[PDB]
Design an enzyme around this catalytic site. Structure first.
Site, PDB file in Angstrom:
ATOM      1  N   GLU A  11       0.991  -1.327  -0.174  1.00  0.00           N
ATOM      2  CA  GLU A  11       0.292   0.207  -0.057  1.00  0.00           C
ATOM      3  C   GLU A  11       0.927   1.768   0.131  1.00  0.00           C
ATOM      4  OE1 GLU A  11      -2.923   0.172  -0.298  1.00  0.00           O
ATOM      5  OE2 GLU A  11      -3.545  -1.785  -0.221  1.00  0.00           O
ATOM      6  N   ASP A  20      -6.564   6.684  -4.721  1.00  0.00           N
ATOM      7  CA  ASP A  20      -5.909   4.828  -5.278  1.00  0.00           C
ATOM      8  C   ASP A  20      -6.155   4.189  -6.071  1.00  0.00           C
ATOM      9  OD1 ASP A  20      -8.422   3.736  -5.557  1.00  0.00           O
ATOM     10  OD2 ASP A  20      -8.239   2.884  -3.409  1.00  0.00           O
TER      11      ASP A  20
HETATM   12  K     K Z   1      -2.131   2.328  -1.624  1.00  0.00           K
END
Ligand code: K
Ligand code: V1A
Ligand code: CL
Ligand code: CL
Ligand code: CL
Ligand code: CL
Ligand code: CL
Length: 163
Positions: A11, A20
Protein backbone atom coordinates in the site's frame (compact mmCIF):
# COMPACT_ATOMS: atom_id res chain seq x y z
CA UNK A 1 7.81 -10.43 7.59
CA UNK A 2 4.21 -10.23 8.85
CA UNK A 3 0.85 -8.86 7.71
CA UNK A 4 1.81 -5.31 8.73
CA UNK A 5 5.11 -5.33 6.81
CA UNK A 6 3.39 -7.01 3.87
CA UNK A 7 0.59 -4.46 3.57
CA UNK A 8 3.04 -1.59 4.11
CA UNK A 9 4.90 -2.79 1.00
CA UNK A 10 1.71 -3.24 -1.03
CA UNK A 11 0.00 0.00 0.00
CA UNK A 12 2.91 2.39 0.53
CA UNK A 13 2.74 5.34 2.91
CA UNK A 14 1.45 8.80 2.00
CA UNK A 15 0.60 11.49 4.54
CA UNK A 16 -1.67 13.62 2.34
CA UNK A 17 -4.96 12.57 0.77
CA UNK A 18 -4.34 10.81 -2.55
CA UNK A 19 -6.26 8.61 -4.97
CA UNK A 20 -5.78 4.83 -4.84
CA UNK A 21 -5.60 2.48 -7.83
CA UNK A 22 -9.38 2.72 -8.31
CA UNK A 23 -9.38 6.53 -8.18
CA UNK A 24 -10.75 6.67 -4.61
CA UNK A 25 -9.58 9.15 -2.00
CA UNK A 26 -7.21 7.42 0.42
CA UNK A 27 -4.59 8.37 3.01
CA UNK A 28 -1.85 6.77 5.07
CA UNK A 29 -1.13 3.11 4.43
CA UNK A 30 -3.97 2.37 2.04
CA UNK A 31 -6.71 3.75 4.31
CA UNK A 32 -9.69 4.19 2.01
CA UNK A 33 -11.62 7.32 2.96
CA UNK A 34 -14.62 7.26 0.60
CA UNK A 35 -15.70 6.20 -2.86
CA UNK A 36 -17.29 9.62 -3.31
CA UNK A 37 -15.68 11.88 -5.94
CA UNK A 38 -16.04 14.80 -3.51
CA UNK A 39 -12.71 15.81 -1.97
CA UNK A 40 -14.64 17.71 0.70
CA UNK A 41 -16.44 14.48 1.58
CA UNK A 42 -13.09 12.68 1.76
CA UNK A 43 -11.68 15.38 4.02
CA UNK A 44 -14.68 15.07 6.36
CA UNK A 45 -14.11 11.31 6.54
CA UNK A 46 -10.47 11.95 7.48
CA UNK A 47 -11.37 14.40 10.26
CA UNK A 48 -13.82 11.82 11.65
CA UNK A 49 -11.29 8.97 11.43
CA UNK A 50 -8.48 10.91 13.11
CA UNK A 51 -10.59 12.84 15.61
CA UNK A 52 -9.43 16.35 14.78
CA UNK A 53 -9.82 19.03 12.16
CA UNK A 54 -7.14 18.17 9.60
CA UNK A 55 -5.88 19.97 6.51
CA UNK A 56 -5.98 16.72 4.56
CA UNK A 57 -2.58 15.79 6.02
CA UNK A 58 -1.77 13.45 8.91
CA UNK A 59 1.35 12.44 10.81
CA UNK A 60 3.07 9.10 10.36
CA UNK A 61 1.94 8.10 13.86
CA UNK A 62 -1.66 8.83 12.84
CA UNK A 63 -1.23 6.85 9.61
CA UNK A 64 0.07 3.88 11.58
CA UNK A 65 -2.84 4.14 14.02
CA UNK A 66 -5.43 3.94 11.21
CA UNK A 67 -3.42 1.09 9.69
CA UNK A 68 -3.63 -1.00 12.86
CA UNK A 69 -7.38 -0.38 13.03
CA UNK A 70 -7.69 -1.34 9.37
CA UNK A 71 -5.79 -4.61 9.83
CA UNK A 72 -8.08 -5.39 12.77
CA UNK A 73 -11.12 -4.57 10.63
CA UNK A 74 -9.89 -6.94 7.92
CA UNK A 75 -9.42 -9.80 10.39
CA UNK A 76 -12.85 -9.13 11.91
CA UNK A 77 -14.42 -9.18 8.46
CA UNK A 78 -12.93 -12.63 7.88
CA UNK A 79 -13.94 -14.00 11.27
CA UNK A 80 -17.56 -12.81 11.03
CA UNK A 81 -18.06 -14.16 7.48
CA UNK A 82 -19.34 -17.72 7.11
CA UNK A 83 -17.39 -18.25 3.87
CA UNK A 84 -14.09 -16.63 4.88
CA UNK A 85 -13.70 -17.90 8.45
CA UNK A 86 -13.43 -21.65 7.65
CA UNK A 87 -10.81 -20.92 5.01
CA UNK A 88 -8.86 -18.66 7.36
CA UNK A 89 -9.03 -21.27 10.12
CA UNK A 90 -7.65 -23.86 7.67
CA UNK A 91 -4.57 -21.80 6.71
CA UNK A 92 -1.06 -21.47 8.08
CA UNK A 93 -0.09 -18.02 9.35
CA UNK A 94 1.75 -16.98 6.15
CA UNK A 95 -1.27 -17.75 3.98
CA UNK A 96 -3.57 -16.18 6.58
CA UNK A 97 -1.68 -12.94 5.92
CA UNK A 98 -2.41 -13.32 2.20
CA UNK A 99 -6.15 -13.61 2.94
CA UNK A 100 -6.05 -10.57 5.25
CA UNK A 101 -4.27 -8.70 2.45
CA UNK A 102 -7.09 -9.48 0.00
CA UNK A 103 -9.79 -8.41 2.46
CA UNK A 104 -7.86 -5.20 3.25
CA UNK A 105 -7.79 -4.32 -0.46
CA UNK A 106 -11.28 -5.47 -1.50
CA UNK A 107 -13.35 -5.75 1.71
CA UNK A 108 -15.14 -8.72 3.27
CA UNK A 109 -17.94 -8.88 0.70
CA UNK A 110 -15.62 -8.77 -2.31
CA UNK A 111 -13.35 -11.59 -1.14
CA UNK A 112 -16.27 -13.72 0.08
CA UNK A 113 -17.36 -13.73 -3.58
CA UNK A 114 -14.25 -15.70 -4.59
CA UNK A 115 -16.29 -18.85 -3.80
CA UNK A 116 -14.34 -21.27 -6.00
CA UNK A 117 -10.92 -19.88 -5.05
CA UNK A 118 -11.77 -20.17 -1.36
CA UNK A 119 -12.79 -23.80 -1.83
CA UNK A 120 -9.48 -24.59 -3.56
CA UNK A 121 -7.53 -22.87 -0.79
CA UNK A 122 -9.40 -24.86 1.86
CA UNK A 123 -8.60 -28.02 -0.14
CA UNK A 124 -4.92 -26.92 -0.13
CA UNK A 125 -4.73 -27.23 -3.93
CA UNK A 126 -2.29 -24.36 -4.12
CA UNK A 127 -1.35 -24.35 -7.81
CA UNK A 128 -4.99 -24.74 -8.85
CA UNK A 129 -6.05 -21.99 -6.44
CA UNK A 130 -3.30 -19.74 -7.80
CA UNK A 131 -4.58 -20.09 -11.37
CA UNK A 132 -8.17 -19.58 -10.26
CA UNK A 133 -7.32 -16.45 -8.24
CA UNK A 134 -5.72 -14.89 -11.33
CA UNK A 135 -8.98 -15.25 -13.30
CA UNK A 136 -10.31 -12.13 -11.61
CA UNK A 137 -10.84 -8.41 -12.04
CA UNK A 138 -8.58 -8.13 -8.98
CA UNK A 139 -5.63 -9.75 -10.74
CA UNK A 140 -6.22 -7.91 -13.99
CA UNK A 141 -6.41 -4.46 -12.35
CA UNK A 142 -3.51 -4.92 -9.87
CA UNK A 143 -1.48 -7.78 -11.38
CA UNK A 144 1.83 -7.20 -9.60
CA UNK A 145 0.27 -7.01 -6.13
CA UNK A 146 -2.05 -9.93 -6.93
CA UNK A 147 0.93 -11.93 -8.16
CA UNK A 148 2.67 -11.31 -4.82
CA UNK A 149 -0.40 -12.35 -2.83
CA UNK A 150 -1.02 -15.37 -5.08
CA UNK A 151 2.63 -16.41 -4.81
CA UNK A 152 2.20 -16.29 -1.03
CA UNK A 153 -0.85 -18.58 -1.26
CA UNK A 154 0.95 -20.83 -3.72
CA UNK A 155 4.17 -21.36 -1.73
CA UNK A 156 3.32 -20.51 1.86
CA UNK A 157 6.54 -18.47 1.96
CA UNK A 158 7.35 -14.77 1.99
CA UNK A 159 9.51 -15.06 -1.14
CA UNK A 160 7.43 -12.54 -3.11
CA UNK A 161 8.08 -9.87 -0.46
CA UNK A 162 11.72 -10.45 0.48
CA UNK A 163 14.23 -8.23 -1.33
K1 K B 1 -2.12 2.56 -1.78
S1 V1A C 1 -13.46 -2.72 12.20
C1 V1A C 1 -14.96 -2.20 11.32
N1 V1A C 1 -14.92 -1.49 10.07
C2 V1A C 1 -16.39 -1.25 9.71
C3 V1A C 1 -16.65 0.28 9.66
C4 V1A C 1 -16.75 -1.91 8.37
N2 V1A C 1 -17.11 -1.78 10.87
O1 V1A C 1 -18.42 -1.57 10.97
C5 V1A C 1 -16.34 -2.41 11.92
C6 V1A C 1 -16.63 -3.94 12.02
C7 V1A C 1 -16.50 -1.72 13.27
CL1 CL D 1 -10.77 5.80 12.95
CL1 CL E 1 0.76 20.65 5.23
CL1 CL F 1 -6.64 2.65 17.87
CL1 CL G 1 -5.58 -29.27 6.86
CL1 CL H 1 -9.54 -22.27 -12.56
Amino acid sequence: MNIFEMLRIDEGLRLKIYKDTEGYYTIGIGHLLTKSPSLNAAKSELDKAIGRNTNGVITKDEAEKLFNQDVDCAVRGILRNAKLKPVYDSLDAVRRAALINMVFQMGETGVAGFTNSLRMLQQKRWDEAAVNLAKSRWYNQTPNRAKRVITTFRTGTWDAYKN
